[PDB]
Design a protein around this nucleic acid. Sequence first.
RNA 1: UGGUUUCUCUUCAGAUCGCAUAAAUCUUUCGCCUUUUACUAAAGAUUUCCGUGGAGAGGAACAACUCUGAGUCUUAACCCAAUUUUUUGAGGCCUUGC
Lengths: 435, 116, 74, 534, 81, 86
Amino acid sequence: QKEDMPPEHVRKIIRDHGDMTNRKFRHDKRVYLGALKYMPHAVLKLLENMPMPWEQIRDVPVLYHITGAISFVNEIPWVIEPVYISQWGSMWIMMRREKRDRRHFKRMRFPPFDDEEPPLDYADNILDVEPLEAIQLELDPEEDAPVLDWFYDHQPLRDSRKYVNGSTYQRWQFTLPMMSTLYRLANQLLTDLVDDNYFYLFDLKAFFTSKALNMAIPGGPKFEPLVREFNDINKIIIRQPIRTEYKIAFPYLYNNLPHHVHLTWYHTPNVVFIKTEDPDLPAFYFDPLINPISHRHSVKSQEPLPDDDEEFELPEFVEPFLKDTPLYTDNTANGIALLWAPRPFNLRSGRTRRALDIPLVKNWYREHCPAGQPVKVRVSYQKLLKYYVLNALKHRPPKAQKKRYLFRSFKATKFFQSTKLDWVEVGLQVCRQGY
Amino acid sequence: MEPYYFVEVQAPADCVSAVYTVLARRRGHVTQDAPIPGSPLYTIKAFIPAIDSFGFETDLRTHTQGQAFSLSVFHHWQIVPGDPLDKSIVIRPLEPQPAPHLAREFMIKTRRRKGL
Amino acid sequence: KAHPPELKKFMDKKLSLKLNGGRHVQGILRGFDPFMNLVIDECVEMATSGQQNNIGMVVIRGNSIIMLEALERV
Amino acid sequence: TKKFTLMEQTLPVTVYEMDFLADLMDNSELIRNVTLCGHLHHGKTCFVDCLIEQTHPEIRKRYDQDLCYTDILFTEQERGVGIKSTPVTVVLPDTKGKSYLFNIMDTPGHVNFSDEVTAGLRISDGVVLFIDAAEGVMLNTERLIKHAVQERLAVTVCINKIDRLILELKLPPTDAYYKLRHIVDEVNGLISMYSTDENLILSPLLGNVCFSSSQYSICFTLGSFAKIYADTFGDINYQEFAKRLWGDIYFNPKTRKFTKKAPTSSSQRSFVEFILEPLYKILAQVVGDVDTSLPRTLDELGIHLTKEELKLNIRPLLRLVCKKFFGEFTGFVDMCVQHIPSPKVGAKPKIEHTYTGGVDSDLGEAMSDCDPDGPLMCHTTKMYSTDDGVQFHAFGRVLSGTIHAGQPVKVLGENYTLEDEEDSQICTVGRLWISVARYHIEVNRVPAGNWVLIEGVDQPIVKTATITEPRGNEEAQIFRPLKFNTTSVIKIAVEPVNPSELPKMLDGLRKVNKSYPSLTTKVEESGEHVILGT
Amino acid sequence: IGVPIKVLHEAEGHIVTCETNTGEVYRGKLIEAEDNMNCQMSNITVTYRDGRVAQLEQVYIRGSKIRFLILPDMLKNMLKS
Amino acid sequence: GKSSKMLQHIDYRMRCILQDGRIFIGTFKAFDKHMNLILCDCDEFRKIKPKNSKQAEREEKRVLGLVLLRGENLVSMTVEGPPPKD
RNA sequence: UGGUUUCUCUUCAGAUCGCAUAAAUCUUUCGCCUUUUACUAAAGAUUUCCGUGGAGAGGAACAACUCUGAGUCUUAACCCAAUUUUUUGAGGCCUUGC
Ligand SMILES: Nc1nc2c(ncn2[C@@H]2O[C@H](COP(=O)(O)OP(=O)(O)OP(=O)(O)O)[C@@H](O)[C@H]2O)c(=O)[nH]1
Ligand SMILES: [Mg+2]
Ligand SMILES: [Mg+2]
């Protein structure tokens, strides 16, 4: 296999090819312009791996050209989803706590360096300097114990075979205290909706049906038309004004010509989940939010009572099955809380996702909103709903091709080596290379 | 005579007040408002008209954010409170006629429909 | 196991009992145990001669019971 | 393609039987025609999916899906309703092992679709009511209690979704027992109000009312749980033990026997302890203890999960543990076979409400005998559509005689009377289909008592009619037309857009009139089409 | 519990033939079959060792004193074992 | 050890000898602890087990069908012919 | 009964996926509108790209085994002797049939 190279190699190549004015490097001038056509892909792989405000330094695998023509970041950011949502919820908490507790927040100057100022050398200027502590909320050592060792690492439980597989970092298996702690760390970014009966008319198929017609929804998306002696007004009782969402709820019965219409899922059994406040109360007790029973009936029915002198006695080696085990532990109510929880938190185990594919704010623009809000954010929620519905509509399935693997084809050649560099050094390289 | 429907609504406690409002806005007369035993939801059993029962379900789930849930069955027939034969009452073209002459309005509309 | 024979249906009914040795008796079922030993009341021995003689209430050991037939409807 | 009826592609991998189905069809007392009704989706569909997932192995496994062996359309499979009353037939055993034959009419649960439930209910002799634990007695539950009382059938409720007591309401065991007892008491009250008869009172000790959660495939009756309890332990008589479990009955741990009050030292019932306590042990140790102390619990239950099975999510793991602990769905088979009067007995009270004449000395005894011979008669009531074809099959049950393929058919209509033979006409059987919900399989003959699809008689059968032998001196009446729970009130005026295709629209209107049993499509004096619905 | 016993219970409700230890032959409907082979039957035809027949409404034969039973062929189609 | 001695002959056609001296020939499909036997397509012989008796091979043969024999009354079994394929 | 991390290649997979969501071409319409790009907002027909699965082959290796969990001659003491079975109410005799 082609192996890793010392990280000083690409550093000296980039540094000797300074601005390509030496006569000694006049044969590599042609290759840098050739590498110009792959600068957008290098930019994409660069910014895809940006290091995540709870990280001081990220070391990325770098695929570089042997003349220093271009530096790629040969890595995909797999970020296991409960950990990523918990870390950004922790970021949300620390940022609100920092913004309220700071006398003056000085905003950065946005062209940070000057125009005639040459870019800094990475080597001295940043290899010497200490990295200035990241955000990293202080975790309770007793309450947040199964998370505290690994929570602000790069790819947290990567080198332990019990919680993930290997270093491809593709599958994860957690224990329920970990899921409970990660689920309560993410509450600032999550919702309180246990069932989707909230989304009766405000769901996806309803918005498809609204796109099919010219109808909009009061908090929903607005679209463009897709189609562009019987109904006598003396012969029709207008008893109730036909409210417009009837055309969504029952599309055939309320419209003429329902073409390209989608059917709607209209009811789920209302999930009644009693959220327990404090651990002093047991796992399952009769909560005072539930209406009592109070058995009452008219005449006692003759339900069978096999009386005495039935002489049926149980033998000695029989008991209730699991009376040896206790009725509940400290982790039972937490697991029942985990059963009604959003998609990453209702599960023990899953596949790792990319950092791109986790929308932290998606459940916020998917819900309709309390009217006291400004006009601005109402239009914004409506527009984000429009973008989501246009995503869900025009979803052609993945179209199974032959996989291409561009970077595996570059590093099979004799012109690319591979190393491991700090992300800031690669970003300074990519900027100098584009210049 | 007018048909009425029997409606059961399953709803939370403030949603019961919401159902009371919406169902009262359709000539309702709520029959029963008992809570459900062993559950934090309430059952609202009520009558409703059948000309007033076009979209009550959808309006209810709109106004309760999908918490209440309504089902409706036919069981009933009672008198429309208007005088069905009256020539003093002049009916407007489109405007919804009040309770004193709904029977005259309905008879005129069904007369113009087929029978003439 | 240690099962009962399913004979409650036949309790207090008149029965015809075929026993080993080509022996036959008739009487009313008054009870039984898991071995199929029977209590038969108003029992009558049906002698091979054809003659029948009243023997009263008796115990038949289930061991020697070949077959029984109800003379009633169950 | 003009097919939207979801993949018939007939390949049942059911457990070695193909002939055994038709052999139990020929026994005529070993067949149970049950229908399943409830207020709304109370798990009736998932439940039958669990029964079939029991039945058919090596395929028929679902992760967050399936539950569509009633839900086989595409508008049906996206709305959430089951709009059609898709029947199914299976053979599945009892606690003992004598495998019965079950014809399940899997009805809807919506108030607007009472037609389907009624038409299934008139063709089957027993009804199974599903009440959600966390709901209680509801609107359509009361309506179907009415309609079950009216058309003279056996009655059994079955409390489904009992997990919602455990995992959603999080009730204590004794409070949950109080809630279940309240549900049973309300069922008995609603029955006692309506039925003049009194020999139908349901109680868990009697064996008819069952307990079965069905996202996780629990199903026990008192007999079935006592069967499990005695199969693990020694030689307890599980019927007599099951007799003494429900209802204010306490276990004295020194005298080792069941009393009515005698330990009053804040104890619990025999049901509460023996049933609900280890059940909540299983539930809690799965949903909160899976990593810590679950295999310790499994080794005390004889449940061996493999390494790959122990790494599932909590819902598939809970379903798998409850499947390996409860096994087959034989408590349901107990409450069926002990309380469905399989159609020897079923003949008489049904025929004394369907048939126009009555008990009388020609037809009545011929029906009540119900041997697969004699004066060939039927009652088809449902009209199920094919995928592409205009033709749509009739569905009914053979009362007397048999049906052969190619045997011609006199379709006695309902506008027919005895001295008016102009309505009835003659056909010939195209094909005989018997269905496992999307598995349609052909038979050469169908004997008495069994359900059957008929191909080729579809032109005279508007909603209700009776099949008889052609040109045979057997003269008989019709069965009564269908009394409905609701009367069709909502009137809709209807007219086409383009007036050049009135005949094709009247054709399709006649087809949907024939398809739904309460659709009323008539033309009033002004010449505008009028559709009455529910 | 034995494999043949399960198959016997399966024949409950079917017409079966039974020969005793003494060679009397009983044909009719099997109502109940116990674990020990105790057999309740109805509407019987009995064929004695001399060849003569008789008719009985209701019978019950002890398992031990049964030589064998003939069951329908409807059952033949427990092939796992 | 193996338990196979019965399981080997399963599905085969088998000649079974009863305590009264009858010969039951059928397809051996199942057995149990007591040696209660399940015999498909079973016939009974009385007079002989033929080894090609030039006069005739078969006298007092009776077709029985599906037979369950109680083990109490079984004496012995030998292989009569191979399994029918069906 | 042979571990499982990891790297590369080949092949096949998208009718409920990748529980995420870009861009391009063509053909019809539009909508603004000096004209062309660059566009708007739809429809349909196609592609590219960022990622994924199943299977097979091969390598990399600081990194894992053969009286072992039981087997085709050896480890579950319990399927080992009061009527419902693996311990006989047996014993005796005689007639009929090629
Ligand atoms: N909590 C819980 N939910 C269940 C159970 N079984 C099914 N469900 C859910 O309850 C809803 C109704 O189930 P279905 O069987 O699809 O509906 P149905 O009860 O057949 O009623 P119809 O749709 O009218 O036939 C579905 O969303 C099921 O997933 C259960 O055992 N427990
Ligand atoms: Mg359903
Ligand atoms: Mg020009």
